[PDB]
Amino acid sequence: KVSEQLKAASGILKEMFAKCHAAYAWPFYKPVDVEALGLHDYADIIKHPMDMSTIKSKLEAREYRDAQEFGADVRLMFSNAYKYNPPDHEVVAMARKLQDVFEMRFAKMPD
Amino acid sequence: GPDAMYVKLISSDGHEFIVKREHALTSGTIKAMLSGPGQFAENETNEVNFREIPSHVLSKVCMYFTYKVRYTNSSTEIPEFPIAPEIALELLMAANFLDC
Amino acid sequence: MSLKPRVVDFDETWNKLLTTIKAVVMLEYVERATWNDRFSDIYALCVAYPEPLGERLYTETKIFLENHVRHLHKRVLESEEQVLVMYHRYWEEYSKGADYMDCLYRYLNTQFIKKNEPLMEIGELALDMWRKLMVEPLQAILIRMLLREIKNDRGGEDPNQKVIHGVINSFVHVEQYKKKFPLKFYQEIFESPFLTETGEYYKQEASNLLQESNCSQYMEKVLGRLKDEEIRCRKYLHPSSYTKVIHECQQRMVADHLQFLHAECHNIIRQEKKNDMANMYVLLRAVSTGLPHMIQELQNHIHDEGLRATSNLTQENMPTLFVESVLEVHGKFVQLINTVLNGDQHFMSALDKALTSVVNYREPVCKAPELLAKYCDNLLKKSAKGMTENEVEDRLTSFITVFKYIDDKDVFQKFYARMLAKRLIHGLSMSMDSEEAMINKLKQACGYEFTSKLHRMYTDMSVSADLNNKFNNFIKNDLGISFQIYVLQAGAWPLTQAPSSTFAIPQELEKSVQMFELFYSQHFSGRKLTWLHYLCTGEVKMNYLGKPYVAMVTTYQMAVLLAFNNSETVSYKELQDSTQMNEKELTKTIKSLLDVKMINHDSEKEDIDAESSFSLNMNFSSKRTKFKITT
Amino acid sequence: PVLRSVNSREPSQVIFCNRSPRVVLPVWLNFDGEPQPYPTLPPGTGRRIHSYRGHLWLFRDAGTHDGLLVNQTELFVPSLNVDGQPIFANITLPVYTLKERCLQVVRSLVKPENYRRLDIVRSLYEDLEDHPNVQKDLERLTQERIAHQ
Amino acid sequence: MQIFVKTLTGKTITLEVEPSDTIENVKAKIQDKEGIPPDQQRLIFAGKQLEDGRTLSDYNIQKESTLHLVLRLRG
Amino acid sequence: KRFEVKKWNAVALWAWDIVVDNCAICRNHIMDLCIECQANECTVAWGVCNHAFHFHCISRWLKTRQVCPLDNREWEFQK
Amino acid sequence: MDVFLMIRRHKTTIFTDAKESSTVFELKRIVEGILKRPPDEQRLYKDDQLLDDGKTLGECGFTSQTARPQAPATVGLAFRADDTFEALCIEPFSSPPELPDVMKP
Ligand SMILES: Cc1ncsc1-c1ccc(CNC(=O)[C@@H]2C[C@@H](O)CN2C(=O)[C@@H](NC(=O)COCCOCCOCCNC(=O)C[C@@H]2N=C(c3ccc(Cl)cc3)c3c(sc(C)c3C)-n3c(C)nnc32)C(C)(C)C)cc1
Ligand SMILES: [Zn+2]
Ligand SMILES: [Zn+2]
Ligand SMILES: [Zn+2]
């Protein structure tokens, strides 16, 4: 099964790394750069960040075994933004859209 | 090779400065002096007498001409132009008079 | 001895400066030292510590300029009809001095003037004062004497160029007025009267010339006058009114005499008029719409000449006259237009439109496709007395020029296909490579979807050799007949697939066919062969006389002659039962044998019926042993 | 107004590089034309910045409010990045005239309530009073752009 | 009655389609006269896509008209 | 026999089972050379369905994909 | 790159530019073009040391970092009269006035 779930997770990740989801998915491509973005309390408040580039780089290594680790990583990545930002925000709206996409494609999870 | 395209400028105290004409035409007043009734001809020497500008100001003005000609339209870094603090007022007067 | 503000006495410095200013305005001699010195003196008055004096200097300079200008417009008014020479002499000095004065008032312009009747800079004030001088005398008197001199230039003698050009250029110097009208004073003061006078003069001259001349001599004179006007405008006017003057002259002359050239345009076209067409075109191109009528008469001339040269006769026996006539007409008039009218694709389009109607005539079915196809075929035959290898392509290169003008490409394709089949199935083509060149030309002229079922025929006629070689090589794996077969592609060749009647294959030729389908099925799968028995030819050496009679006949003749082998006399019923062909086909082949006198009917019945019995002629004789039927 | 910023909402990455011997202060033009200031840059430094396409930046001096040159021009409008690369931003001293250089030195050395005790000409008194202003520069650029079109 | 359709390779062919038949029927006729399944088909008439679930009479198709056949498209 | 036959010639038309078409890749007839060939013997390839294709065309494309350009189903290359 | 100098004799100052690879017989030629003295009698002096003929400026000790346009160097000049050289002598410039009270730090 390992092959099946790993292939499905890679497919979902690459579909979220698509060419016309860029309307609401470009922030998460690379690590958050507080120095070049102008943030002070981000590092203190959010202890653990996560992102697509690190996910993929770890994927090409023997580090990801079960799809639940990937699911927890995705949930952590969205919860970080939900925690840091106020309720009404552009990043909140775009993260909610991407979360609905992930929820659909994870209800479509072949297992 | 050697030429006579160099103007000669004379200070009030009796100093002679020999500067290239293209460098000198930066000043509007010098251009006005050299362009009109009083133009040179034959075996004459290109001279302009400044009876109201001492030597330590005219040398600064000549160095400014050289600096401006050298560091114009250059992609390299342009250093600051130094001015001693005890000549600032005289330099300001001479710059206002010479239109530069 | 410093650049510090002071307290200064104006009048001494004002006098010392006013002495030099007059020597600068009039271009006098001033030493170098004073020129350099006065710059310090102006600065001294411009930065005087109590109540700086710049407004007073401006006011005192304005009075000097106004006095100088008012005095100049005394000594120029008192001139007694020699105004122009004094004006130019007093203008050159004032201009070269007003240019130099501005360079000496630089500090006042930079500091005081450019920080705020609006005040004007010195060089802008002097030109305004001269404009005031140019208000009263310049307009009436000097515009009159300027128009008179240019009128006197039209013949007579040549007045001085420098004075006139300088006075004309003077009005342009409103230069420091760069706002939506740098050249408005010039126009309003000089250009409109000049245009009106030019119009009146050229109208009257055109009327006078038309009164005492014909249409042939009119054009050369008009061209000469136009060239003179063009070469004289550059000598006097500012480079912004050449087009207006030339346009007004052309409009006046030609438009006023328009319905007089459209009368001779018809006559010049019909005759040669080599030197008149160019003169008419060069002066009718630039005036409104005069070309269309010439277009129409050229088209009519082409149509009339083409019909008179083609539709008259063609000797009723020779189709090579059509192409030669059309080509000669086209080449002659293309050369004429290129040599005289210098392109002008309107006339080329008219020529094409007229040749299209010439070639595609239809008396109240057009014969153009038939003649074109027959020309191609007779040119491509083997040889009667025809041309050589590098002449057929030479003529066919120009043939396509005639070819493009036909409107029915389909009929030409049909006729060419039929005649190409006829030429190919008989091996009578002059050179096998020529068809490839003709196909390439037709493809380059029409398109790829137009010559496909000619290129496929070429390829088949090329591949048949290899297929025959292959079958003859792989046969030996005893027939008695030399077998050469053409394999053809159905759906492209114009051959009727449906047989006319049921035909029984000759018994002696029953193994060859079966071996052929066996081989073809073995080495070519998916193909359904069909046999057309009315294209095959056979050879027979008869062995019932004392001479080696050898004949070439068709398949139906083969079968009918073979039928007699059992007995010398056979009835119609026996032949009908054995061959199972229709009555019409058997009748035709029996008649063909009767015409060559191979057989004779037993009874006197000239027609053919159920009881028709025939027996071969006993004593047929022929001078030539080898022969072909109705050769 | 005319000169302002457009909410393109598309990311862009830039590198502010300083090659002048003075301190630099960037100012960003808002969506209504009211400029806003941003932290300063030490001489000879390169700082990575995140911005949007179609925004307006102008570079000034920290304390003297003098103007400097970016990419050998006055303004800087970022463009979308290609090949995943950042776009450099050179900062260079303009070649001042002698009058302006002397005015700067005098302004630095003299208190702004001690001008009319200098032994100079009358006009230089108001010339020294005419301080550089970002508002004045923006106004001038506005009619410059208007006349260009 | 009879209309005309153009293929992808350059030829043109004709069909006898009444103004009462559905566009699906036209697609099936094209498929059997050609080698293109109906899923990969698209019809152009006056620069307008023809919906599968309709008929000719709704689109006001007159006599002897011509239609362009193009493959399936997506954004 | 009364006579002997020496030579014979014949002609014969033919057609495919059910096919007529143009190559959909390079838009040249099935019985014609390729554009790649024209720059200078290649045969004609067929399919399980009724598509007459072109040997060089179909090979150069089957280097990447499999199915028919008109049938995105499969490829046979047998007959 | 390029070095800048100030050739000086008595009250006359000559402004020129030169490359580090040039020798003394390129300054001598310019002095000839402007002053027109004996061609082989211009002993060029730096500080208190004589410079030879073929030896370049870089060997003499000229660098482009310390001979900028804002501050060129100085090379003395000596002509020969009556077949004997005159002792080097350069006259200094003027002196600035006293700094005013208002500008004092
Ligand atoms: C070091 C330095 N050197 C001399 S000055 C300087 C410096 C210069 C600029 C900056 C930051 N740049 C700006 O503030 C830009 C420059 C100019 O284009 C105006 N500007 C703006 O951001 C303006 N426009 C907007 O902000 C657009 O409106 C969006 C709502 O405002 C968001 C305010 O927060 C900006 C900083 N980011 C955050 O607080 C969180 C961060 N935002 C985002 C983010 C925010 C909005 C969107 Cl649509 C997408 C992503 C973010 C990420 S990761 C990432 C790469 C980004 C850009 N992110 C994620 C995931 N979760 N949170 C984030 C403004 C003036 C209204 C603040 C920092 C330092
Ligand atoms: Zn092909
Ligand atoms: Zn091929
Ligand atoms: Zn298929």
Residue numbers in the entry:
A (entry chain F): 349 to 459
B (entry chain D): 13 to 112
C (entry chain A): 1 to 116, 134 to 381, 384 to 496, 502 to 655
D (entry chain H): 61 to 209
E (entry chain U): 1 to 75
F (entry chain R): 20 to 59, 67 to 105
G (entry chain G): 1 to 105
Question: Which lines from the publication concern this structure?
Answer:
Cullin-RING ubiquitin ligases (CRLs) comprise one of the most important cellular regulatory systems. The scaffolding module contains an elongated cullin-family (or “CUL”) protein that on one end connects to the substrate receptor and, on the other, to a RING domain-containing RBX-family protein. A CRL’s E3 ligase activity is controlled by linkage of the ubiquitin-like protein NEDD8 to the cullin subunit. Here, using a combination of biochemical, cell biological, and structural approaches, we unexpectedly discovered that the UCEs catalyzing the crucial first step of ubiquitin-mediated regulation—priming of substrate—differ between CUL1- and CUL2-based CRLs.
To assess the structure of UBE2R2-mediated neo-substrate priming, cryo-EM was performed on a UBE2R2~ubiquitin mimic cross-linked to a recombinant BRD4 fragment recruited to the neddylated CRL2VHL by the PROTAC MZ174. Similar to the neddylated CRL2FEM1C priming structure, the map (3.4 Å resolution) allowed for the placement of previous structures. The refined map also showed continuous, tube-like electron density emanating at the C terminus of UBE2R2’s UBC domain and traversing into CUL2’s canyon region. We reasoned that the density corresponded to UBE2R2’s unique C-terminal tail, important for processive poly-ubiquitin chain formation. Although the density was less visible after post-processing, these maps still enabled assignment of the backbone atoms for 15 UBE2R2 tail residues, illuminating interaction with CUL2. Indeed, the cryo-EM structure of neddylated CRL2VHL bound to UBE2R2~ubiquitin with BRD4 and MZ1 shows a minimal interface between UBE2R2 and VHL in comparison with the neddylated CRL2FEM1C priming structure. We suspect that the specific tethering of the tail in the CUL2 canyon may serve to restrict the conformation of the UBE2R2 UBC catalytic domain. Although several Lys residues were targeted, the results were consistent with Lys368 being ubiquitylated to the greatest extent. Furthermore, the striking target lysine specificity for MZ1-mediated ubiquitylation is consistent with strong geometric constraints imposed by the CRL2-UBE2R-family E2 partnership. The loop appeared to be disordered in the neddylated CRL2FEM1C priming structure owing to a lack of density in the cryo-EM maps, whereas loop density was apparent for the BRD4 priming structure.
